[PDB]
Design an enzyme around this catalytic site. Structure first.
Site, PDB file in Angstrom:
ATOM      1  N   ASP A  35      74.109  37.447  11.486  1.00 20.72           N
ATOM      2  CA  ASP A  35      73.392  36.393  12.210  1.00 20.72           C
ATOM      3  C   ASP A  35      73.483  36.675  13.692  1.00 20.72           C
ATOM      4  O   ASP A  35      74.480  36.338  14.343  1.00 20.72           O
ATOM      5  CB  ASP A  35      74.021  35.044  11.898  1.00 20.72           C
ATOM      6  CG  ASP A  35      73.308  33.911  12.595  1.00 20.72           C
ATOM      7  OD1 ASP A  35      72.222  34.147  13.152  1.00 20.72           O
ATOM      8  OD2 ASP A  35      73.860  32.784  12.573  1.00 20.72           O
ATOM      9  N   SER A  79      58.899  37.218  25.526  1.00 18.04           N
ATOM     10  CA  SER A  79      57.698  37.890  25.038  1.00 18.04           C
ATOM     11  C   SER A  79      56.560  37.728  26.031  1.00 18.04           C
ATOM     12  O   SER A  79      56.471  36.703  26.717  1.00 18.04           O
ATOM     13  CB  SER A  79      57.307  37.313  23.667  1.00 18.04           C
ATOM     14  OG  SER A  79      56.082  37.791  23.199  1.00 18.04           O
TER      15      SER A  79
END
EC number: 3.4.23.22
Length: 330
Positions: free
Chosen positions: A35, A199
């Site tokens: 994770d 992004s």
């Protein structure tokens, strides 16, 4: 040193991925959910409340000649999905894919929430976010990666998740056979303890690319792609009959649909998520309403590039003094 381990989807939907991990002496092999959005290595154990264990493999520290109680230390964690676990702490030898750390904090669960009990395939979590998020008190502990780092050939690990197929976690090297083209690196903020990046924008299907900054985290422990409501609405508007269902808890679409791809930007590069990756199948067994793999982050407080996005790429988690992320097509 290096390590290389195969990671395997837990079910036909790629809801999560499990990676075998050797703990203790002699080795006890547990299948852990790696994770990148948390920083605790915790396991089902001989200490876990018996009614909360249903099929998991447990760690038994009393059977490990290298286990040592970390006296006084406790831990307690709450995840974004509302799940939780807590317990006490041992140090022990932990190996992943041939890479060994001695003195790793192994957080032994005394209590786990229902979602953990109900998932017999996941024996615990191995956190790979920054150690500033580790919940051990009163002495915070390091992740497996942070403890391995100084020994690794390069201070990196890579995530190569499969679509309906096994993939790979590598530690200490970048497998130049595992991706196509070049790797585009992008800046990371560690301010929240995550692999947080920005992004450069998105496209829906064959549509034009929208240049827009989307800050979010690279989180292998989250199944879906959670993005701003504007972006998510733009995606599902291209699927006839798709709608947001407050009863189901997100966007659903007709199972008869063919989904468009979704592209996200990494600097001037582009990662394309095929439409099929965005199908999470019937909302309930036999339903003709299917659950979408792109969902709004509006109710979270952060955008999450979860497995839907990451499995479309070869992803480099660069833990150099200035951390960075890299993405390549594959």
């Amino acid at each position: 040193s290096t390590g290389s381990a195969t990671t395997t989807p837990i079910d036909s939907l790629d809801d999560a991925y499990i990676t075998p991990v050797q703990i203790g002496t002699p080795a006890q092999t547990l299948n852990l959910d790696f994770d990148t959005g948390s920083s605790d290595l915790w396991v089902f154990s001989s200490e876990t409340t018996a009614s909360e264990v249903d099929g998991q493999t447990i760690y038994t520290p009393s059977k490990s000649t290298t286990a040592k109680l970390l006296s006084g230390a406790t831990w307690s964690i709450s995840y974004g999905d509302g799940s939780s676990s807590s317990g006490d702490v041992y140090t022990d030898t932990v190996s992943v894919g041939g890479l060994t750390v001695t003195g790793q904090a192994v957080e032994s669960a005394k209590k786990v929430s229902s979602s953990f009990t109900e998932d017999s395939t996941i024996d615990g979590l191995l956190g790979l976010a920054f150690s500033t998020l580790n919940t051990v008190s009163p002495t915070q502990q390091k992740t497996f990666f942070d403890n391995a780092k100084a020994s690794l050939d390069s201070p990196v690990f890579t995530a190569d998740l499969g679509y309906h197929a096994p993939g790979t976690y590598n530690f200490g090297f970048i497998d130049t056979t595992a991706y196509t083209g070049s790797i585009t690196y992008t800046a990371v903020s560690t301010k929240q303890g995550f692999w947080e990046w920005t992004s450069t924008g998105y496209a829906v299907g064959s549509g034009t690319f929208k240049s827009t900054s989307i800050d979010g985290i690279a989180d292998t422990g989250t199944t879906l792609l959670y993005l701003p409501a504007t972006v998510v609405s733009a995606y599902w508007a291209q699927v006839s009959g798709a709608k947001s269902s407050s009863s189901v808890g997100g966007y659903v679409f007709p199972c008869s649909a063919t989904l468009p791809s979704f592209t996200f930007g990494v600097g001037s590069a582009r990662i394309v998520i095929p439409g099929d990756y965005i199908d999470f199948g019937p909302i309930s067994t036999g339903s003709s309403s299917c659950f979408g793999g792109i969902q709004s982050s509006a109710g979270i407080g952060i955008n999450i590039f979860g497995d839907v996005a990451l499995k479309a790429a070869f992803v480099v988690f660069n833990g150099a003094t200035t951390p960075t992320l890299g993405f390549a097509s594959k």
